[PDB]
Amino acid sequence: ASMTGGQQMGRGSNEEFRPEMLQGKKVIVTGASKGIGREMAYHLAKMGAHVVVTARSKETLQKVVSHCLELGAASAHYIAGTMEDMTFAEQFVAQAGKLMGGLDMLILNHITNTSLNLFHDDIHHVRKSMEVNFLSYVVLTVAALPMLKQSNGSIVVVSSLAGKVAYPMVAAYSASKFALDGFFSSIRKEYSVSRVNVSITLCVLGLIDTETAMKAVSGIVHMQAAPKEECALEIIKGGALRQEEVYYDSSRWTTLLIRNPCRKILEELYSTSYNM
Amino acid sequence: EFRPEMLQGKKVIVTGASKGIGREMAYHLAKMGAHVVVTARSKETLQKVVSHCLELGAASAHYIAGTMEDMTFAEQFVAQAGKLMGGLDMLILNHITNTSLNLFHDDIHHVRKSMEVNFLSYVVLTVAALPMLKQSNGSIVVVSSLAGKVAYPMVAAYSASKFALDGFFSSIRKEYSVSRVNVSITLCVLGLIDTETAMKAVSGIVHMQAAPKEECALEIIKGGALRQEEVYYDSSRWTTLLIRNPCRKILEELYSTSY
Ligand SMILES: NC(=O)c1ccc[n+]([C@@H]2O[C@H](COP(=O)([O-])OP(=O)(O)OC[C@H]3O[C@@H](n4cnc5c(N)ncnc54)[C@H](OP(=O)(O)O)[C@@H]3O)[C@@H](O)[C@H]2O)c1
Ligand SMILES: NC(=O)c1ccc[n+]([C@@H]2O[C@H](COP(=O)([O-])OP(=O)(O)OC[C@H]3O[C@@H](n4cnc5c(N)ncnc54)[C@H](OP(=O)(O)O)[C@@H]3O)[C@@H](O)[C@H]2O)c1
Ligand SMILES: O=C(C[C@]1(c2ccc(-c3ccc(F)cc3)cc2)[C@H]2C[C@H]3C[C@@H]1C[C@@H](C2)[C@@H]3O)N1CC(O)C1
Ligand SMILES: O=C(C[C@]1(c2ccc(-c3ccc(F)cc3)cc2)[C@H]2C[C@H]3C[C@@H]1C[C@@H](C2)[C@@H]3O)N1CC(O)C1
């Protein structure tokens, strides 16, 4: 332990993933009682990492923690509460970081319960989507940044194809996912010039075979769903490799067209438009 | 091709119209003979715009002062304006909360205020205006930015609110298409303009070739009247070439076959 030293990241480490990259890493996973969140928890447990999981259900989180330790998690803990409460979001991070003695990766995955419907007048759902899916993520980031700066850590933001392109029946949801891109892509550029060695991974996902998604699309949307296990891993891979964006969808056509080279070009052209 | 006669007698709302691009839009509409209801917080500055609008030949010109931080004011403003003009043909959403260029550290109050003013009030204003716009087969004009399409440092909260506008309004545009709601949605993606606020905020930080606010305001009205989905306005030739996302339109068309 004390007689041990070196680095997992060398030549090729920016390109090829190894589960050893997550060995002994301190990770937070939000919305981890089910779906992709729970699948990410499980993969991190297997890779030999420390985990602190959160969601509103204490019972469901207990089950995840139990199973997480069984898979070989360096440590597994939960803190239950709602991400509607900005005070809970802020203290959760400090309370979670106390448990692990720091933080290497912050996985922001939770969303407020959403169903497919046309927008008419539900301003409460518009506001709640902005608060839970976007604002809580900002609060969690502010609370986690001192620890991530110490560890030269990572922020992993779970977004959607609906956070890159427009879709009907998800206006409030899509607004909150687009906001994530605007916010986190802007601070990534600030961290670059301020030499803050905290990476930011935005994960653009298509349909995933989670219970919630399958029930929500039932009889409304007829689309191929990708497996939640592989999705969870691809998210962790991009985070560990410090990739700016991760794309995961069933369609070959999506993977080919989702990338925006012109955005990357426009963003480069203003390096020469910035003072000290 | 646009014609100023398209706005002749039209019932238009212009938000954030006491100065800059908003005031320039209020002036162009008055020249075209539209009925106008302008808003911002400054009663004095709005009076000057109304007077200068009636001076340019507006069919009618009114102002209602108040803050877009108050969702109740936003909702009631539309009904109030709708009572004044006897309906609505165009809703121009232009206001934003006062923003300066700074690195993000812990200002969650500015993140929340940016989402409330620059995004949420736009949604509130739209909900309140939609019955009238459905009657007139009207238009919604959303003033966004290049920072609402690409990432920029020192504007995290602002950029988040402009990206949110794209997500929201582009999604409801697709819903209006399938629900056969004949209300068009124009998202205006603007580059650096020569307004007092922007010229002051970029001073000693960034320099460019500031596009004129007069022409900008007209290009916004043009896109709205022509019912264009998106309007792009910037001084750079390279921006106009790279700003468009054809692959997004292609991907959006592929998922139309799934419901
Ligand atoms: N599923 C897909 O097809 C798909 C596609 C694209 C993107 N994504 C993204 O992937 C992520 C995970 O989706 P999923 O389908 O795996 O979700 P899921 O199975 O529905 O799980 C949602 C998780 O968030 C928690 N949560 C709900 N409300 C919350 C609140 N108020 N405060 C805190 N946590 C809350 C849930 O537990 P409690 O209810 O007990 O709180 C649960 O752990 C989301 O960011 C989603 O947008 C998924
Ligand atoms: N100028 C540029 O370079 C540029 C570039 C890209 C995009 N844009 C977009 O263009 C639009 C207009 O920009 P501009 O440069 O013309 O702005 P501006 O001169 O700063 O005008 C802002 C307007 O919003 C009002 N406003 C501010 N806070 C308000 C509040 N809480 N409630 C209601 N009204 C409020 C202001 O007046 P009061 O203080 O009296 O209320 C004023 O009428 C914005 O959406 C901006 O993002 C501009
Ligand atoms: O982000 C999600 C997943 C999801 C969604 C969103 C949009 C549509 C969709 C598809 C074709 C259309 F034409 C219109 C809408 C269907 C489902 C699920 C349902 C609902 C909203 C959102 C998050 C979860 C899970 C929530 O429960 N997705 C799947 C898309 O690839 C991006
Ligand atoms: O949207 C605006 C205008 C504006 C802004 C935003 C970002 C930068 C910028 C430039 C180079 C960088 F590298 C980083 C940031 C500079 C100015 C102005 C200042 C401030 C924010 C925002 C709205 C108004 C006017 C508000 O008063 N713009 C001009 C860009 O083409 C898109």
Side-chain angles (χ1 to χ4, degrees), chain A residues 1 4-6 8 10 12 17-57 59-251 253-263 265-270 272-275, chain B residues 1-42 44-179 181-205 207-208 210-236 238-259:
Chain A
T4 315
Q8 298 277 0
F17 175 68
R18 302 215 329 272
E20 289 75 45
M21 286 171 170
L22 274 304
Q23 192 180 296
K25 299 294 186 183
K26 299 155 191 192
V27 194
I28 279 167
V29 196
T30 76
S33 63
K34 66 202 191 191
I36 315 161
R38 179 177 62 191
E39 291 305 312
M40 282 190 286
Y42 290 172
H43 277 297
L44 288 156
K46 285 188 257 177
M47 294 185 217
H50 306 269
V51 302
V52 185
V53 295
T54 189
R56 294 167 303 177
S57 183
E59 289 70 19
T60 320
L61 286 167
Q62 275 166 358
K63 286 182 181 144
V64 182
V65 167
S66 310
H67 199 264
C68 244
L69 289 163
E70 188 209 333
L71 294 164
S75 50
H77 299 265
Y78 79 90
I79 302 152
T82 182
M83 288 297 179
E84 288 170 88
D85 186 348
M86 299 306 136
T87 305
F88 166 77
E90 188 186 353
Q91 52 211 210
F92 161 71
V93 174
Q95 280 182 39
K98 279 163 189 162
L99 286 163
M100 299 185 291
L103 188 69
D104 294 293
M105 190 172 280
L106 177 72
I107 310 175
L108 305 172
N109 176 92
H110 68 278
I111 63 149
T112 194
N113 288 6
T114 312
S115 71
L116 298 180
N117 280 105
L118 299 170
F119 178 78
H120 293 285
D121 63 348
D122 200 348
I123 190 69
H124 297 98
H125 176 66
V126 179
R127 194 192 259 98
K128 195 187 260 188
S129 296
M130 288 305 328
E131 285 281 314
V132 185
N133 319 349
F134 167 71
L135 208 83
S136 77
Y137 279 45
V138 180
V139 170
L140 293 157
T141 301
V142 175
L145 202 59
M147 284 187 282
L148 297 166
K149 278 167 157 168
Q150 278 159 6
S151 74
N152 289 4
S154 290
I155 307 157
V156 186
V157 185
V158 188
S159 190
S160 162
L161 285 180
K164 286 295 189 176
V165 303
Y167 279 83
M169 306 171 274
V170 283
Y173 171 82
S174 181
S176 72
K177 295 295 191 175
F178 267 75
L180 287 176
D181 190 4
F183 191 85
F184 286 97
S185 296
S186 169
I187 67 165
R188 186 193 290 117
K189 293 199 173 284
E190 294 182 358
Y191 292 1
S192 178
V193 304
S194 308
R195 292 176 269 259
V196 168
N197 308 288
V198 179
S199 66
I200 295 155
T201 310
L202 188 73
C203 309
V204 184
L205 320 177
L207 192 62
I208 308 301
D209 65 1
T210 69
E211 276 191 46
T212 311
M214 298 305 101
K215 277 184 289 87
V217 300
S218 208
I220 304 154
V221 177
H222 317 295
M223 175 170 290
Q224 183 63 62
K228 57 184 179 196
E229 293 72 27
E230 187 184 30
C231 181
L233 182 65
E234 291 309 309
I235 291 163
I236 298 160
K237 279 189 190 165
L241 294 172
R242 303 174 77 87
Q243 298 176 14
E244 295 198 2
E245 298 204 343
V246 162
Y247 310 99
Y248 185 83
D249 190 56
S250 292
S251 182
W253 303 11
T254 293
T255 71
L256 262 93
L257 299 160
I258 197 56
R259 292 166 173 89
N260 189 357
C262 296
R263 174 169 154 176
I265 293 161
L266 269 181
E267 277 174 17
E268 185 159 74
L269 272 137
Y270 70 59
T272 316
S273 173
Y274 203 152
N275 247 263
Chain B
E1 199 86 297
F2 175 77
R3 308 285 229 98
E5 290 76 43
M6 285 154 180
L7 283 304
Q8 195 181 296
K10 297 295 187 180
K11 300 155 191 193
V12 194
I13 279 167
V14 196
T15 76
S18 63
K19 66 204 191 188
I21 294 163
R23 178 177 62 192
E24 290 306 311
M25 284 189 286
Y27 289 171
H28 279 296
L29 288 157
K31 281 188 256 177
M32 295 168 187
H35 295 269
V36 299
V37 186
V38 295
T39 190
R41 291 169 298 179
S42 303
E44 285 68 20
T45 321
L46 286 168
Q47 275 167 359
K48 285 184 178 219
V49 181
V50 164
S51 306
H52 275 312
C53 277
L54 282 174
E55 220 171 75
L56 287 168
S60 73
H62 299 264
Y63 78 89
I64 301 154
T67 181
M68 289 298 179
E69 289 169 85
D70 186 348
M71 298 306 135
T72 305
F73 165 77
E75 187 183 1
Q76 295 179 4
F77 161 72
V78 172
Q80 235 129 246
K83 189 179 189 160
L84 286 165
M85 298 187 291
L88 188 68
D89 294 294
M90 189 175 280
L91 178 72
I92 311 175
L93 305 171
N94 173 83
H95 70 276
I96 54 146
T97 197
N98 287 8
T99 317
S100 63
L101 298 173
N102 280 106
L103 298 163
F104 176 79
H105 293 285
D106 66 342
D107 201 348
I108 190 71
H109 170 83
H110 176 65
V111 178
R112 192 192 254 96
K113 194 187 262 186
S114 297
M115 289 306 326
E116 284 282 313
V117 185
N118 318 350
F119 166 72
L120 207 82
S121 57
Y122 278 47
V123 181
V124 172
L125 293 155
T126 300
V127 174
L130 202 60
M132 285 188 281
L133 296 167
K134 279 166 157 167
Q135 278 160 7
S136 74
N137 290 4
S139 297
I140 306 157
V141 186
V142 186
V143 188
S144 189
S145 160
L146 288 178
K149 286 294 188 175
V150 303
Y152 280 83
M154 306 171 279
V155 284
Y158 171 83
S159 182
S161 74
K162 294 295 191 176
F163 267 76
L165 285 176
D166 189 5
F168 191 85
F169 286 97
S170 297
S171 169
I172 67 166
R173 185 192 291 117
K174 292 195 179 290
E175 296 182 359
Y176 292 1
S177 179
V178 304
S179 308
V181 168
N182 310 287
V183 179
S184 66
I185 295 157
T186 311
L187 189 73
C188 310
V189 184
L190 322 175
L192 196 58
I193 313 299
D194 69 6
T195 62
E196 271 187 42
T197 298
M199 298 293 79
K200 275 180 73 275
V202 300
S203 204
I205 304 156
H207 318 261
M208 282 292 275
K213 57 184 178 197
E214 291 72 47
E215 188 184 29
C216 181
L218 182 65
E219 290 309 308
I220 291 162
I221 298 161
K222 278 190 191 165
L226 294 176
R227 304 174 76 90
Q228 300 175 15
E229 294 199 1
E230 298 204 345
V231 163
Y232 310 99
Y233 186 83
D234 191 55
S235 292
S236 182
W238 296 38
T239 292
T240 72
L241 260 92
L242 297 159
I243 199 56
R244 291 168 174 88
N245 192 358
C247 293
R248 168 167 153 183
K249 178 162 163 64
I250 292 159
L251 273 179
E252 285 176 1
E253 214 104 280
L254 301 166
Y255 317 131
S256 78
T257 57
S258 293
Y259 61 104

